Symmetry: C4
Amino acid sequence: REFKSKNFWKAVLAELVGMTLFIFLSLSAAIGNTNPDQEVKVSLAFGLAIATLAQSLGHISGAHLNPAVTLGMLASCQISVLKAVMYIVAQMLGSALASGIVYGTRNGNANLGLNALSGVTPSQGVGIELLATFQLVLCVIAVTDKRRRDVTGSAPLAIGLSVCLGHLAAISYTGCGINPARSFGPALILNNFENHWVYWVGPMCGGVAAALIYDFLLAP
Amino acid sequence: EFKSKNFWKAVLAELVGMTLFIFLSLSAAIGNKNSTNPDQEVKVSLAFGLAIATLAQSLGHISGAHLNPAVTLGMLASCQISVLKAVMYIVAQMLGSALASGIVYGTRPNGNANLGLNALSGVTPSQGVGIELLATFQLVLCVIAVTDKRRRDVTGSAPLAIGLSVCLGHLAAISYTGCGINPARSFGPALILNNFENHWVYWVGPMCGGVAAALIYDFLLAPK
Amino acid sequence: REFKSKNFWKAVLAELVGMTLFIFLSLSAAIGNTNPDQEVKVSLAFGLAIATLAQSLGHISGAHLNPAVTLGMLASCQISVLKAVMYIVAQMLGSALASGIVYGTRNGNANLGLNALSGVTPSQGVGIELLATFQLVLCVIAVTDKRRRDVTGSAPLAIGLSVCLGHLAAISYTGCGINPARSFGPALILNNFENHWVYWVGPMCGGVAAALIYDFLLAP
Amino acid sequence: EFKSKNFWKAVLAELVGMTLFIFLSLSAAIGNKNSTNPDQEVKVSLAFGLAIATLAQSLGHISGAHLNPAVTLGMLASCQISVLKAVMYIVAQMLGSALASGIVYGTRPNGNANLGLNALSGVTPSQGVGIELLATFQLVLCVIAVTDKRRRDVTGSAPLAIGLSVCLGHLAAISYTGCGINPARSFGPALILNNFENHWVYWVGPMCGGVAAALIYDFLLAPK
């Protein structure tokens, strides 16, 4: 073990603080006040949280704030195993901590901030979460490709808009998890892990393939 | 030609990107299916635009991220690609669109009106061709002007500009024709659902709009 | 007179083609299908039309597409009087031409694409249009200030978002004109010039002050 | 100090920009006044964010475009401005907010609930302070991190990032507290309407959130 490296602890700490802010703001927007109409607001808040916290903390920790993105970075050999494990631990702790506050301020059980299923089987929910996270991790890896000089725009904005796209595509079927750490928090605070594995198998593989297709196939 | 990896990886990027683009856009098309109220209008516009704004930022360095036979034809008219590259691009776009449509219609049901099929809502085909043509003209004109390698004033996110152009074409054409501006996007669901009613409108419109945007930008607006 | 200069005719022509596309797409979005809910859609379409046509034609004509912006540029001495007059003529012709098509494809008289008044006197409507165009022309002039090197973002996107902001602020009071050429088209095709001067005095002065406050006061 | 034009033009830019910011945001607050449905929620978020995303792009080269006493205090905690500049900034922001509020409430009526006044909707003041504090913490942290002159990875539109941060703070706090994250924005209407109920929440929240964001970014996250 023996991590050390003072800047590495700040990377893990930036992931923790950013995950707390990310989950607090996104769940506070979801639980704000039917749901089909509210979907647009929820998508915008979840995208802008990434588009802001990445622009604020990417130079300090890469601003993953997503275990699927962290696994996509680990599959691309851009971080170490120890750094990825500590990243996921910090993201899960920040997500549970912020989830406790947002579910403390709280419509009975409506709670749109809990990844459930709405019209799809778990076998289909895994595919929906997998493609909705594949596009996200592919965007994160391609936009952070150090071999490119054409990215003259806001990369955190591109990643946040990718999250918002995954929401626009997956919030009506599975609530759009695309973030195992964001699906654990509410499931831990409410103590409801029904169909929770769908929001872990789906995103993670979607991230891993996003690395493998990008590196070992698309852009060698 | 038919070997150099830079061409085949471009075709493969077109296939993967078109599959992701159509899957993500069609997943927004169904979902809450019912009601065509302005909030659904805006949401569908946003999803269809952000799919480009993400997949272009992810695959443009590999294939230009056309994901649109009208954009591919506009690039062919601008002499930026070859005919063989355009043919393989259009085939890849149609295949990716049909495949993603098959998956989305596997998760969704039959689809009475579905809305994920570009149809007509209050306009004749003579008017629908004009609406689709101008809505694709602005898109291909934007793509060619923003990717003009003779410009140094483009200091913003070009995939974001193209995605916002798609979103604008939706905001302007989704209530009349559903906004196709992509023959492959209008082909996928029409192939899986086996419904090609007024399908020629969404090929004549986009293709001619892209070729005209190319000629007006190059042969008129920005010469050479 | 004798304009000449081949590139100047292309500047006027780019203004004409861009104005036709701008008015067609924006009015087609407004007349698409109550109104308070539709406001968001109308604002987005009107902002994205600028954010796209500027990114497509600014290197060819500056992409004014707005007589208030053209007057703000003329007050800043960035264009000539002949070029500004020809610009306004091209914008008015393109607006009337596109307005004829959009009002040809057309709810009785609802027509949100016609600048009317909804809860404000003309004396107040002039102030609303003036500030809503002041912010726009100020943004256009400041973002196109050739003495700045900090503008590392999409300037057409900033201008389009300024238009969208003017819509979010003025569409419920006056319908948000902030464009004398965009207020003339529908008023000419429908032959209804009631309170039309409000949508000319308001924006123009709002643009002129935007120049004077920026140059002769804020940034000399 | 109290002479050099670069300081006074900055204060004047703060005044003009705050007047435009509050006028444009409050014009969105009234308008259709009634109903607090998610579409009004999103629309108010967009107007309040785009006002920053435009006025910052217009006046940041002249004054940094704080337009927020919490952002000004966060910059003072980051030692990027002096105390005199911060005092003149806060005075200019309060004056511009009150003036624009007077104009907007001249075009609008009395305002039963108005919504253009940051109040409480389902949370205690102890919870409202936390919501306003985190919603301003993210904003000031973003402003300081994106304007860190030691970074070269900020290749996007910084005023757009700050405006989207304001829009996010609205999407997260407008249903609980109306989203203040700007003491001057919460002061203007409260001064013109003469209603300072729970006004201290929208000063303790934003100010402390900005100072904490400055200390956490500088003294912890990004040293030196």
